[PDB]
Amino acid sequence: DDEEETYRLWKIRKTIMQLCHDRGYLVTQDELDQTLEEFKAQFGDKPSEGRPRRTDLTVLVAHNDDPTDQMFVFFPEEPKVGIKTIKVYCQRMQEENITRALIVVQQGMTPSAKQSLVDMAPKYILEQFLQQELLINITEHELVPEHVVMTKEEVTELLARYKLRENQLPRIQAGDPVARYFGIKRGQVVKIIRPSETAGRYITYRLVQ
């Protein structure tokens, strides 16, 4: 169906806007609170043989702190992203000189392509996201507490206050769904703020490892 499929595109885009906004990228308010009709009106048709194309759904956002820093969100049309598709995106990133990008895959990536992202990880950071994952914002789930990425200055202050080593903190896997949501790499520290039934509020810190 097309009415169902277009709903996915709007919902996936909404999560990306929230994901980008939560990552500190400049996402305007109307983009976040964009209705399905507004998305449907903006693209004006249905996916199958219609105006809204996954290629035309690409999103470019700029970090609030550094306007030069930017990120792509690519929606590959093919169900399985191959090496050639990644190189197309990799070549495109070179033209705009953008380091970080997001690929919202339909079903999965061919194993060679998955290795390709890691191979180019230093120069360019490409993050694979499954389409099913983006259909919801896990950060909005009740079980998920508030995650805040700590700046290097804050992490230094944290360890100094508690006389702690990095390995002494609780860990969060780099592949954690929330860690992937925030695009945190190994060595970064996540500040988790939780409601506590005893204290009222509790802050814990998780190192990405």
């Binding site: 202050e157 944290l158 506590s196 039934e197 009222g200 509020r201 802050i203």
Partner: protein, 97 residues
């Protein structure tokens, strides 16, 4: 504090576990000092406000004046301080206790 509580306890269950039983402590104070509930009180409402503020500073779980220690100290005693403020409020100290 009321709105903070609503987030901590969305179900609205006011039963909590906290260190000091303030209601019984007040009851002990009434008996120890023979408080007469019928007569007007000589406790200034401001002394209640200032007294509770001074008390909150004395109840320290995370010592330290740095912002990280101050925030943890605020979080560690958030629930008790809310309970303390809503029990030792000036209105209630003069109305029922």
């Amino acid at each position: 504090d009321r709105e903070v509580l609503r987030v901590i306890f969305p179900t609205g269950d006011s039963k909590v576990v906290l260190p000091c039983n303030l209601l019984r402590m007040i009851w002990n104070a009434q008996k120890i000092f023979h408080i007469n509930p019928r007569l007007p009180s000589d406790l200034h409402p401001i002394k209640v406000v200032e007294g509770v503020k001074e008390l909150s500073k004395k109840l320290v779980i995370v010592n330290g004046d740095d912002p990280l220690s101050r925030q943890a100290q605020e979080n560690a005693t958030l629930l008790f301080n809310i309970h303390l403020r809503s029990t030792l409020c000036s209105r209630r100290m003069a109305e029922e206790f």
